[PDB]
Amino acid sequence: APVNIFKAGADEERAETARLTSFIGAIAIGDLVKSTLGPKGMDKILLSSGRDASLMVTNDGATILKNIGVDNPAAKVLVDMSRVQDDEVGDGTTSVTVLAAELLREAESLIAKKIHPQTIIAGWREATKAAREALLSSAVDHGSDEVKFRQDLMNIAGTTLSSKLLTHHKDHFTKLAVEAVLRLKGSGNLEAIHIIKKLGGSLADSYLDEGFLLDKKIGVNQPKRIENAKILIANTGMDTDKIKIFGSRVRVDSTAKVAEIEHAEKEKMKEKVERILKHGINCFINRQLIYNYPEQLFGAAGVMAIEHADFAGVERLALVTGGEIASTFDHPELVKLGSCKLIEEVMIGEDKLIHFSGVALGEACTIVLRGATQQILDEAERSLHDALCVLAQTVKDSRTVYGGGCSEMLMAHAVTQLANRTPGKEAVAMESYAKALRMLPTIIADNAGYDSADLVAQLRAAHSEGNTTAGLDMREGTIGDMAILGITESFQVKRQVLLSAAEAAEVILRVDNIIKAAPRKRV
Amino acid sequence: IGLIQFCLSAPKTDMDNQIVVSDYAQMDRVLREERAYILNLVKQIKKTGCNVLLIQKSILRDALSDLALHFLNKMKIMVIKDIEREDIEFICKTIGTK
Amino acid sequence: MREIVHIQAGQCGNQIGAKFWEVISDEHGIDPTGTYHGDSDLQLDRISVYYNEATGGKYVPRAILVDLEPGTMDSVRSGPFGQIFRPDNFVFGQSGAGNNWAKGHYTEGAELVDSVLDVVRKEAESCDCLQGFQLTHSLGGGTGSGMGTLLISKIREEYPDRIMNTFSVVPSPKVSDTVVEPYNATLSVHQLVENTDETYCIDNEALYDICFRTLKLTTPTYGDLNHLVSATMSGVTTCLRFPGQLNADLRKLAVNMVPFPRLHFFMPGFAPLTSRGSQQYRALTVPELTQQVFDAKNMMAACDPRHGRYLTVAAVFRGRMSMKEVDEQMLNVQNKNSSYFVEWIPNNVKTAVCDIPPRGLKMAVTFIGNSTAIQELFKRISEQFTAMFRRKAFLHWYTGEGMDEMEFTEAESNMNDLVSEYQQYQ
Amino acid sequence: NPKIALLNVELELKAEKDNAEIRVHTVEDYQAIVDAEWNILYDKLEKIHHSGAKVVSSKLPIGDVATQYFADRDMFCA
């Protein structure tokens, strides 16, 4: 195919530069986000060449790979791998990128050993099957005795926020992340926790609101605070209805009848508001816009009117007040109203927001992130999003494993025990699978500046004879017990790091020909 | 001072409105009834007792027509147009209007 | 029936008219020396509307080319398919107009327009039912304003009841050719709102930025200028030249374009605008082409539709598509952007379609409709007319041929009355 | 043993004469027009039915209404 090429502007390579470009392009992705892994790793700042560059600092490996725009074909497999890891569990996107790159780096070492690439695939399938049994047998469940499960949930949020910008804020941001999912008391919808980013103040000034915050302040001549009110929301049109009959006009003979029709239009718009206040309410939230004619009617009756909050803002108010959407007002005995105590307006960062203090059945939260710059607020929002998504799945799957390098040495030990019970064809591929699992505590140990040649060697000697909870202590720089220090991760997060990296390395290693087509508008 | 968000102009609705003229005297019933329409709006304003009107800036239809401007000048009423929709919060808190 | 005789009068009218018949002869498959190369009644039925069939199968276009210049119309004599017209449809003029309105009416027009009316009479013999006439000219030209204004007045002595669809090339607000361009634009329009009913506005210099930015042309010229103008000319006369479900001829277009007969200045245009290399890398759907005509990137004149309000909207599509999606897409814009449309018209955007594809493009739509975009362009013409007439600059060029100082006074009073005519509903 | 019906008609609900304007004055007669547009199409389907023509062939398109009617009456169309 290179000799006597039958292509126009397209090129290809077979078994010489195919695996060469696949191993170079995938290691350079993994070596890029290598410095961001661990609780002592640095962060990246992403910039463009111009034309609203919109600089966005991120430490999470999914947000780095989704914005760099790699031109390598085999590197897009690892870029899409970190996107699925953020969409499923929301954590380990950096850990699954280095692990999939360390598998292909050990596969580059098997180039000169003349090992068949299908032997490495069949050797890694038996290695990944033994690695699933190491995490499944070491998972710690939590059913009853809930005072130890809430302590276990703070160890999950303490491990996730340690590898982010919120380093010296674990005394505050752990309570902001555990109690946010604990106030859901149900499914992890991940949209009732509305994060509001406001400039001014430090990250210690951020807090979790006991009620709910909103924008689009209360009318013009309406009351600003009503105590012991009944909140009724809506999703209906207020004025300029044009009610659902396309092709309907007002064909009259004189202009005196147009004055009678427009008075009949305002009488039906007034009668719609009169059906709303028969419930006995004091606040009104409409998803659509409220014009001036129903605004005067709510202001004359002493009723609030919040106009055009959000499409998903009426869903959070329905989960924090315990009511319903109620888009049709014709049955006051079948419409459930919300409950609150204070609807006072608070000022956060020279902006008046509507505080719904003292609400009943409040299965929704509002995190008020305050930072020094907008770059910190964009990073702390993604750092909190990577912490709330794991706790939303830890309450659904209570199985937890010991992180901090302890889980990877347990997975590498089960592969090494079965590497000695195999013939020599697939045993060399299983030894490279166990060395790549030991690189994940090696990257964490070397990012702090510790002796990674000795600490991982002490972890391999500890896990070889007992010590199932022995891991890497990044606080002092030694080997400690992970059950005492409280460094644990979720089982489903660590399983998706192991499983998705083994499936993505299976695709790139099986590629022997990269036939790229002719691009458009590139000359 | 009174803040008015109504448009003192010809009668029109949100729906499509048309006038059918099929008679000789029907053209007289269009112009003279439009003058009697806004005269009932000016005399409703004049009998209230206000001297300063603040009309909100309308985009869809005309807020203050030329026919409505002449009746308000004979009632000795100062009329101010083009008040923005984002400025009505500052006006109602300062003067005390609704 | 419903025959229309075409009159291409002026220097700019023959340049547009040379490529005006290139689109009709290619879409209908009419051979210039053979008989026809059609396929069905979509192309072969409407031949007799714009062509008169001779004995033997040869088709002759109903076209009259008027020019006060021998050298300009010789390109349409034996050039790009110019040998297909009648030999008496080549009325030359040995005396040039000189970009003067008074010279084309009283000096050149007193001896030629009796012979130009004879060519319309011979063309009307083969018309069993004359529908109307079209007139493509320019305001900044001598023959377009001389033999376009006097020709449109003498044609009403013989055809007082027939409709008229004039095509006017407006001058540009960006560049200027001569200082008598506000004089020629004011005098030609002053006798155009008198007894006509349709007039478009095409700016040629405003299309140089469209070809530079959208059509990707580095050095444009007059040949690349008239290519997309011919696509706009063929978009209006699409249902007139091809049958279909939405039957709307020029008689149905004269009523449903203007609620009032005086405010008959439209803004033509079409969509999409693709280059010679980026055309195949672009898909064309129904809401893609319908939403492109309302923006300012698809205007043939130097105007701004983002600060105006339309009155009547008509659109003709090219290709077999579902036309029920056109009305549902445009009705959603009339509720969110009601300050740009009419408040009492339930169906502002009209629908038209055919089953004949255009040349080059796969799908294509055209934009025909009036708005207040001509109001801001008529103020700049009367502003230049006010400063030149108050100093009485170059008035001896006009008053020496038969004009007077009271002629420009009445031409200034009614043209400023047209500014207040558009200022009511703005 | 089927019977084939060869048609040159539209089996859609939106069959319009392209110039019809149904001006109504009341809501009692407005609902009667919408019921008439379905009864025009359903009367054509009753002519295809009660004849044995289980296979329908037409050069003009058929909408979702007449497609689901033949599926309930165990008839094929194209």
Ligand SMILES: Nc1ncnc2c1ncn2[C@@H]1O[C@H](COP(=O)(O)OP(=O)(O)O)[C@@H](O)[C@H]1O
């Ligand atoms: N307190 C701690 N002690 C030891 N290791 C830790 C601690 N906190 C975090 N880590 C390690 O740092 C790593 C951070 O990985 P991370 O970049 O969050 O992966 P992802 O990008 O997939 O979320 C984890 O694998 C975890 O083992």
Ligand SMILES: [Mg+2]
């Ligand atoms: Mg993490």
